[PDB]
A paper describes a structure:
The first step of the route is the production of N-acetyl-L-glutamate (NAG), while the second is the phosphorylation of NAG by [name] (NAGK). We report here structural and functional studies on the arginine-sensitive NAGK from [name] (yNAGK). The structure of the mature yNAGK, lacking the N-terminal [name] targeting sequence (residues 1–57), reveals an unexpected novel tetrameric architecture, which can be described as a dimer of dimers with D2 symmetry. The AAK domains occupy the center of the molecule flanked by two pairs of interacting DUF619 domains.
Author numbering:
A (entry chain C), B (entry chain D), C (entry chain A), D (entry chain B): 67 to 502
Write the structure that this text describes.
Amino acid sequence: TRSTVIQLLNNISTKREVEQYLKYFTSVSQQQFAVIKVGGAIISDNLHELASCLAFLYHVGLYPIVLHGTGPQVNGRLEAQGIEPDYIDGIRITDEHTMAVVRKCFLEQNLKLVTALEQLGVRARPITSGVFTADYLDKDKYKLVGNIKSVTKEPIEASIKAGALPILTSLAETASGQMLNVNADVAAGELARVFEPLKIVYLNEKGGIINGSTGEKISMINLDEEYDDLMKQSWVKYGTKLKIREIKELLDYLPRSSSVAIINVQDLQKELFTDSGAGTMIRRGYKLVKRSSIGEFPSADALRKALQRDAGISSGKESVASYLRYLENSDFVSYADEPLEAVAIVKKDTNVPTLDKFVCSDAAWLNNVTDNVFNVLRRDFPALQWVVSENDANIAWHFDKSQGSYLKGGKVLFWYGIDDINTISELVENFVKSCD
Amino acid sequence: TRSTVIQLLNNISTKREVEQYLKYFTSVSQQQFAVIKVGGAIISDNLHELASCLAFLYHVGLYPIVLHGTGPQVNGRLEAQGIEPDYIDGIRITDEHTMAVVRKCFLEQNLKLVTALEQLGVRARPITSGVFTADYLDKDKYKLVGNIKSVTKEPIEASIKAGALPILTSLAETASGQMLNVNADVAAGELARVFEPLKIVYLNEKGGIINGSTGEKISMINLDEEYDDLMKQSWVKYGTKLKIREIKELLDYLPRSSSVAIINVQDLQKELFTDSGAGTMIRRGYKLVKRSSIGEFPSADALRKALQRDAGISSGKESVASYLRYLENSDFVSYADEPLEAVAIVKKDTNVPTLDKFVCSDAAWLNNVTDNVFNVLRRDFPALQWVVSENDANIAWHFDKSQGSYLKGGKVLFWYGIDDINTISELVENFVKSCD
Amino acid sequence: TRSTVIQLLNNISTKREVEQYLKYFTSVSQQQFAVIKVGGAIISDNLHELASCLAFLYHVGLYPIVLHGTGPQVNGRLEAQGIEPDYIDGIRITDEHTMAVVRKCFLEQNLKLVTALEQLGVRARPITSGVFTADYLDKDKYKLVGNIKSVTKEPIEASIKAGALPILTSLAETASGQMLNVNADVAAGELARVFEPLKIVYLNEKGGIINGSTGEKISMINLDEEYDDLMKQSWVKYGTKLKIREIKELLDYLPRSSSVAIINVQDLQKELFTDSGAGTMIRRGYKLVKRSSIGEFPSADALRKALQRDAGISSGKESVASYLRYLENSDFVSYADEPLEAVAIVKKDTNVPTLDKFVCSDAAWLNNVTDNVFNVLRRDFPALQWVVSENDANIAWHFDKSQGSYLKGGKVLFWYGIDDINTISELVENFVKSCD
Amino acid sequence: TRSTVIQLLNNISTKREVEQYLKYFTSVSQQQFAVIKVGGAIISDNLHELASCLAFLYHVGLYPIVLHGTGPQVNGRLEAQGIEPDYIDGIRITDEHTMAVVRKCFLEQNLKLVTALEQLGVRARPITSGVFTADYLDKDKYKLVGNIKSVTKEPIEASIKAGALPILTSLAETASGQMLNVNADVAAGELARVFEPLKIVYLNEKGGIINGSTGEKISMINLDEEYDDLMKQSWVKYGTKLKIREIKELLDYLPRSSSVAIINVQDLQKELFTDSGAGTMIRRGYKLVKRSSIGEFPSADALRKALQRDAGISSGKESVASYLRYLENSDFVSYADEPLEAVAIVKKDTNVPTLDKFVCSDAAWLNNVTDNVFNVLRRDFPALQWVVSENDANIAWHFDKSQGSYLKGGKVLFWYGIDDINTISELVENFVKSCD
């Protein structure tokens, strides 16, 4: 009804978000929406919120594949029953007695989420077995704990197809039928490899990643860029490292378009579409490559193909040829990602270096490659100037990345990092005098 | 719509059927509608008809619990793979290698029925595990074949409740998780014990229990009476015994009414309501006790109490006293159930023996004790005559059980087994001359 | 849901009714279901029952065209407003002041039924104008009272089509737009001529037709048969005659399938389908015509079209041509109704005349034309024989019409009126030897 | 489904629009949605678009009252039939013969829109009569053309209530029943007066209002502000004046919240919610009032109540008291609308006058009172400076209204109209030095 329209609008903040939401809906998504790993903690305690939110996705069309675990509840019942639980190497030692109680919990939890969604008018389908094939992790060490050998898709598909949210337990079974306990996170990840979904979401109770050393939360992690010198940091806790790595390894084998998000339940249906949602959002993103020379770029040609995108060389003031000659005879730094989706060229020659070209693709903008290119520029050029058309689609954005702005006919001058009142005036003159 | 109303009316023949259909609908059925056991043969071959028909029940409201097996398809894939299948004691010897192929078949079949029903707009819910708990039948003999220890209802209920036909595979699993093969018929029977449903239907491919000796089906089987010598027959196969016994054992534990019907898929939605639906109908019913002498009946008195029911001794032409004298001085066979709900007395003295009294209770009629009493009479008296009031409630029925009929004022003469035109004429004369 | 199925079955008494209901549903009804004229009395007073009942039809699919008046309520409001009503020649003198109060009543009533049905989940569509075109009855005499010149169907259709019970007021309007008061019964009839519906139902408060001379109510009138000598009766009141004729004239030009019913509201959703409902039900129905010669039947051809129905000439043993040659060369009597829906041919040539063909339509059976044909046969042939298939739909019926029966493989021999033990035996032999 | 979500997002451009849309939905709208007058031209020609668009509103919950005319089609059929149409005083002379052909058109068109909407799954309800009561405009002059005396709401309500878009023809009728032709626009306006709806939309084929003298289209007209000196303009054509006045007069008697819009059909479901839709949008709106003195404001007090909204006086640096003292002792110009929803105060005292306070309500922003206040400021202060928080919700907007910007910690300095490089530097210093 409008019940859905309200809740969508209530979760839209800016224009960029509207465009995002449409991308997912206007996507002819034989490429699946999302795999959402749900902790057991959440079903037992915070269910209404989870259901309400899955109901929304269902209603707006999208079909998340939900995969849930069964954590705390199990340990109480094992204690109730007089069995002190076991963890060797961070995994549960899982003998017959324990497995009985683990499975009964799984089914109880699984059906509780399904009957809940069903009560909010969503079609659910419990899938308590036969998605995951596996074999023993180490029969001596973990007893009945499995290593997932393969995912059969057919039930998860012919659910979605029939119009019903598939709710999966994270039990795998062997050929011969013996069920085995498997980490809900490793199972999540195996699904993700197999459906290559647009979003992968790990719902924790906790809520993303806090930086133990600054206190500041982490919004986004750009693995290709940040992974290595964020992993080898003293503040990052080892439970974090064993997940950050886990995720890097997943997204290594999934497309670039694919992302992962770690979120508290309550902030979900925001950061399933935004990156301003609190909670942490991780993806590969692009290694920018710093270059000081035309004959550095592996692409002699495709550098031209990229700069042609610009609406000052495509509307011919200067051709690229005439511009590349000028470049090669000038000390410049150029950041560009591997596939030349975003090139930035900074002419270093005038105090307040100019960002002379910043040719960024429509795809580069919605992927905030641009955001990242400017963050490089920041630390590499503590003071900087550039020009934008008065009606560049995202002028707002340039304003935001600046400290000062001037507008002569048509063009806006921007800069940052500078505040000699008299060196400012020098900028503004050279710019206004630039009308030749 | 009407689509459903047409197909209901198209399957209503007489008044008695209308009354029947109402009984099932007007039943405030927290006592469940039906358990329908579907052979694997039917899903692989005759699916459309099965789905179309379950779709009907679903549309008219009713929610059958459907439990399917997975026969031939498995045996082909076992043969494809080079394994000659094994049956000891009518159950499959089932090792790891066999179980893997049995379970993959079950899921494949289960989902195929579900995605089929779903395409005809019926909500199905695959329930591939966790209805049945079991333990090993005999681990040495059958390997991974289970004995069903208990049925958990909660999934089958909270399916129906959420509005979707529950389609069960007949796999059980042990505490510790190992799945085990169980006969689709033994599993069907365990469900029936626990939901006590109004109808139990075993769908077979042939269309009942065809008699290997005589050639044609066995319509009603009275277990208490017929079981033992209708099992130890030379024509009867061993897969039949593991059904016949399985059913005897079920109905031993269910009320005198609860019945089983064995029916071809093609005429399912006739049985589910009427008992037109010819095919083998099996139930406990009564041990009829054959007697040749008044002073045989343990009840000297209650024989009188029974014959008083008759509306030719209750409207006093002859009292019972005056009739019991006549009986005792005549060679007669009398079949009567233990509680004298139906007495039949056959005077043996005239070629074409007379069925002289057939005193059957209102309760005996709706319980087809009558049907059964006549089936005894059949084999014991290959030729027989009797008299019915022109307006006996169920005259229709007597016509049906006859080969020939004559009507003098008030009374209708019936017989069977005889066709000497001249011995027929002798019947009709002795009857018309019976007007004294 | 079943809610509808229960209420349908709860209103089915006998077999004949089941067949009737089917007729209406299985009708692919570009030929409409019903025109139901509702008195104003009923909307103001007995509404719940009228809505509950229309709802039923709506739910079981059927779309009655409802046309309502506005009687008693008007006369109170005219009196409330100080206008003493006028009747000249049994019609309301209807000036501007009266018309204003009549129209306001009509709309109020019309919407009250619509909003009522709508509250029971039925889609209604008020149609307050533009169905009936008319011109002044007599402008000097009745002022604004109209004579219906024509019905425009388009609204009533594109309502039903879009799924909504059309509720019509009985106002007509002139070309130029002036609304005029018009008889709700003459309007009902004009609709009927134009939609050719299956049921035409006049809901009166009264409740059918009583016989002033016996006191006995009239269930059914068979116009073709009874009209003439029921019209020229001294007991029949003139207000009755002016209606009986009215109806005869309507149904003369509507199909044979069509009927009229005059019922008290409370007995409605019984005698919209049964003929055992109290209230009077009228229709054309059938005189049987006795014929002794092929070239007697006015239809040379349609006799063939009739005999083709038979499942021994349609499954081609003998074609009709070859059978008609045989008939024409044999003394036979043939009873057949006017429209050849039931033919019976009796070959007179063998002692115990045979009923050689008895070709009776599905419509003829539910009409009990058959019953009547056999009653003619009775007095005209005091002894008679015939043969029926062991599984003829209505074998029960033949048994009933017989005195004696024999069954050889497949076919049953029947007769009546004979009791020379030795002429009986002759029947049974000729029949058993008929296996030729 | 999503079908609705897509079409909503496809019509949202900026943040401001999101907020607008939420206003209409989150409105507990016992205050109705809209009256949409549709020209006859659109049904006959451009129907799909009209239905597709009314369907949207229906789907997102909103129930427009549609009132349609019947223009060109009528004039063709009158010409087909050989009658040259009549217009005296811009209205149709409408005698009996014409009325017949007018009414038939109306019903034909009306039902065509209803059966169209119905095909897109919207419930429509034709309302061909009984909404409008009227009497003759001038019986001699126009014959059967009416003047609408009153609107009865009951049908239109009990439609919406029963869940169906009411589609009204613009025929009125007299007490006594004579239907009369009435201008679709006068009728639309009469509905508007009676339901006081949020939006009144006149769909023309043409598409809004062009300025004959500049060529520029007119987006919005702010009647209270512009009416008088836009009416007494030489370029405004008289057909425009007769409409502008028409509308002024309507909105005079409707709330301030109510608006009128004149749009081409294709741009409809945009400027039913936005004001950036092409087409013209008219409403009463807000006169800004220029003030030079505290004791000018009619509100001694509510000026204080307004300035308290500001988050530099609400977070207490300076109270309003202490600020109002300063104001009164300073030459300042202050623009504010009548209800003080948006105040701007410009301290004139420093070359580059400061906009010292600009206190604008959330409602003032979504109304673009702010936009208009700055436009006044523009012509009155050709050069101007002001300060905004770095994270003021709508900082983007300030940027846009500027020529130059500087950012010291926290605060952004803005200005326009000035380009002495050295007077700019003077601004930036006085600002950076403003850190006390």
